[PDB]
């Protein structure tokens, strides 16, 4: 069960997202309500037990606040989300030369071409400019920036 | 090629090494290539020695 403090924090996030004044969040937004509470759910997590519709699809369903409360508790708060240790050894698959450096093109390609594919718009928005000559991107610095 | 492999004993040598343990991998190689499998088991950078 959640604390009164957790319920109020989840509510404070909720009261922004129902912005029409309905007391109800549109179902599409629920994964980004979870992201707004600092959990990092996959779109595969989002479409299953969190009950989200298609990606970027509005209108199909809406969620009351009390309905949202088990949808925080039993979902991303009931699983592994990954740590630093995951990302470092997943990135080391693409560390050809062992120096902590990956090409910016290769790192953009992993984000855009693999997994739950990122838009180029998303990839530029998360890029902190850390590209040298052909010294390329320090991937540990990238992980620490994205997990802060 | 199959008839030659039967008659020259290469197919015997493969059934022989399957009785034993044929694949032999260094402790360093096993850790360095395959860490990606088991982040839950393989902890922190204090886990040296590699055995």
From Swiss-Prot, chain A:
Main function: Non-regulatory myosin light chain required for proper formation and/or maintenance of myofibers, and thus appropriate muscle function.
Keywords, comma-separated and alphabetical: Acetylation, Methylation, Motor protein, Muscle protein, Myosin, Phosphoprotein, Repeat
Keyword flag Acetylation: yes
Modification Phosphothreonine occurs at: 26, 42
Claim: Transferase is one of the keywords in the record: no
Quaternary state and interactors: Myosin is a hexamer of 2 heavy chains and 4 light chains. Does not bind calcium.
Modification note: Isoform MLC3 is acetylated at position 2.
Record's signal peptide: none
Recorded superkingdom: Eukaryota
Residues bearing PTM Phosphoserine: 28, 54
Protein name: Myosin light chain 1/3, skeletal muscle isoform
All copies of domain EF-hand, residue ranges: 5-40, 82-117, 117-148
Gene Ontology biological process: muscle contraction
GO molecular function terms noted in the UniProt entry: calcium ion binding; structural constituent of muscle
Gene Ontology annotations for the cellular component aspect, listed alphabetically: myofibril; myosin complex
Swiss-Prot record, chain B:
Top-level taxon in the UniProt lineage: Eukaryota
Transmembrane annotation, as ranges: none
Compartment list: Cytoplasm, Myofibril
Expression sites by tissue: Expressed in type 2b myofibers in the tibialis anterior muscle (at protein level).
Domain notes: The rodlike tail sequence is highly repetitive, showing cycles of a 28-residue repeat pattern composed of 4 heptapeptides, characteristic for alpha-helical coiled coils.
Protein family according to the UniProt entry: Belongs to the TRAFAC class myosin-kinesin ATPase superfamily. Myosin family.
Assembly behavior: Muscle myosin is a hexameric protein that consists of 2 heavy chain subunits (MHC), 2 alkali light chain subunits (MLC) and 2 regulatory light chain subunits (MLC-2).
Protein purpose: Muscle contraction.
Protein name, UniProt field: Myosin-4
Organism: Mus musculus (Mouse)
Lineage start: Eukaryota, Metazoa, Chordata, Craniata, Vertebrata
């Amino acid at each position: 069960e959640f604390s009164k403090e957790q319920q109020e924090d989840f509510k404070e996030a909720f009261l922004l997202f129902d912005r029409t004044g309905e007391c109800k969040i549109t179902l599409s937004q629920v994964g980004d309500v979870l992201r707004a509470l600092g959990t990092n759910p996959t779109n595969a997590e989002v479409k299953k037990v969190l009950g989200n519709p298609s990606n970027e699809e509005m209108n199909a369903k809406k969620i009351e606040f009390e309905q949202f409360l088990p949808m925080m508790q039993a979902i991303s708060n009931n699983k592994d989300q990954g740590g630093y240790e995951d990302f470092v050894e997943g990135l080391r698959v693409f560390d050809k030369e062992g120096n902590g450096t990956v090409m910016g093109a290769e790192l953009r390609h992993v984000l855009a071409t693999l997994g739950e594919k990122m838009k180029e718009e998303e990839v530029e928005a998360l890029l902190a400019g850390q590209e040298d000559s052909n010294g390329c991107i320090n991937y540990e610095a990238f992980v620490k920036h994205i997990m802060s | 090629v199959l008839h030659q492999l039967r008659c020259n004993g290469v197919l015997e040598g493969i059934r022989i090494c399957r009785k034993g343990f044929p694949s032999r991998i260094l402790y360093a190689d096993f850790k360095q290539r395959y860490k990606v499998l088991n982040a839950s088991a393989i902890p922190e950078g204090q886990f040296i020695d590699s055995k």
